[PDB]
Structures are given as C-alpha cells and as structure tokens.
Symmetry: C3
Subunit: 112 residues, 3 copies
C-alpha cells in the first residue's frame, strides 16, 4: 500500500484532482504548505537574488492507493501538473503499513 504525496502549484489542484478521479481513486487529502526547491524560491532577478531563500505557497496532495495502482497515480499527477516550468512540483511515494476505515473497521486494501 502506498501514500503518494505531491507538492504542486496551488492553481493546479483542480486539474490534478480531475486526473485522479478519472483513475478511480477512492479518496484524497490536501493541505496548505510552503516550500522551495533547487531554485530556492527565487522569482526575482535583482543582483544577489540567488543568495536569497524564499518560501512559496504550495498545496500538498496525499493519495492512499494500492500497489497495483500507485504507478498510474504518479503518472497522472505528473501529466496534470507538468507545464514545463520550474516549481511544477515533486512527488514522493511512501509505504503504508496499515489502514482502517473508522466507521466500518475495514482494513488495509479494503480501506483505501
């Protein structure tokens, strides 16, 4: 079982959600975060700007999915978010040891 975590530009949330819905994902969690990547949050070109570091608003998307679906989920997020521009995002896949649907007690692959 996999937790696919993606950090994307906020305006891309709808398209990413749409892309995942098409795959039949059974749930999604999103949160507000800030971050930088290898350009260190630089959006200006004043002298010395590359020595600065800034945090930029992002959205973190988390989707719990089965092993036989996670690769397609990763690809869908890539395809939805990629516009060929810096900051378009990064995806991290983590493993889920156990899952439980609170209302029903269903577990693991049933619970995703």
């Amino acid at each position: 079982m996999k937790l696919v975590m993606a950090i994307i530009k906020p305006f891309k949330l709808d398209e990413v959600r749409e892309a995942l819905t098409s795959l039949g994902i059974q749930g999604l969690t999103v949160s507000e975060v800030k971050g930088f990547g290898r350009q260190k949050g630089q959006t200006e070109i004043y002298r010395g700007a590359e020595y600065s570091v800034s945090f930029l608003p992002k959205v973190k998307v988390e989707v719990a999915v089965s092993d036989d679906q996670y690769e397609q989920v990763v690809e869908a997020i890539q395809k939805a978010a990629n516009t060929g521009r810096i900051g378009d995002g990064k995806i991290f896949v983590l493993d889920i040891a156990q899952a439980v649907r609170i209302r029903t007690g269903e577990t693991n692959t049933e619970a995703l």
Copy 2:
C-alpha cells in the same frame, strides 16, 4: 515504530485528544486539511449530486508510538471518532525508521 495518522471530523478533535491522553499518549501533532473519501465529498442529496466532487474540512492527527502500542492507539481513535456516519474518518499507519527528541538527543523508542 509507527506513525498513526488519522483524518477526522474537526468537531471530534477534543474527544479524540482526551481518549488518547487517557490512554496515555505522550505526544500529538494536529493540522488542518481538506479531503474527500469514497463518497467524493457529497453531503447533499439532490438529483445528480452523486456526480460531484467536493473537499471537506478535516483535522489530521499524528501520533508517533512504539510497535507494541500502536494498535491500542488506532482502536482508541476509532472508538472516539466512530458515530456510524460517513466521513467519520480514515487511519493510515506509516513506519518510523528513527526518532530523535531534539532537546535531549534521545533516540528510537526513548524519543517518542
């Protein structure tokens, strides 16, 4: 070691917190998120509403605990949050490879 991550209805935070403190947890992190589950955020019953997707406010509760204690934590959260209604929550358990208490430098299960 295990990170227990529960996504619950916001109004249940206090009852879940109290259940866990009574159980004896020694730490807890909470954050605001939005999300949907297998009902796609549907809270209305008008004709066609079943084709829509919405994000609902939730709270994410995270508790790092030892292997021999995580099942008790999961069940305590389930008992506190379960009211037999959709959206009552989802619990994901991830493995923690290492832990450190920053003040003291204590590690592993001693840091939790």
Copy 3:
C-alpha cells in the same frame, strides 16, 4: 531515500532552513501545525509549531538529522521531535527525473 520530518518551535525555522541549505539541501517543505508532548502543552493545550519535511538520500539523511537537531535545539522543553520515514520513490515533475536524482 528518507523523509525527515521535524516538529520545531516556529521561531527556529530560519536557522533550521539555513543549516539545511548551507549543508547543501536543495528542497524543503514546511507546514503550520499544533501539538503537545510529555508536558501536555504546559510551560491539555495545543501549542503552535512548524512541521519541516525534507526528502533526502540514504547517504545524507544522518547529516540532515544532526543539522536539524543542532539548529532547532535551545535546551528548553518543546524543542521538538524528528521522525524519519522511508521514501520508496520520488519524481521531479518537470523533468521526469526519479529517486535520488529527483531530490
């Protein structure tokens, strides 16, 4: 690969950030959270914290953990916790680079 997650005092964010970027880290995610530890929010209550998340390779995560530990410490209760999780796969969206190349 590892996801190093640290819950720190909000005023320590700049030093933790600088410790990491000076070390050579080239990405960082931060979130607003609340929490309590062994002292139950007492000098039960929730207190504001920052969650820092850094994805790093196996050969650098120990340096990263140590850098955060030193940077976030003050010797006072509430200094925080570092939890290290494993990352199975990573992708840089723009380039399609994967795993350690993506971080």
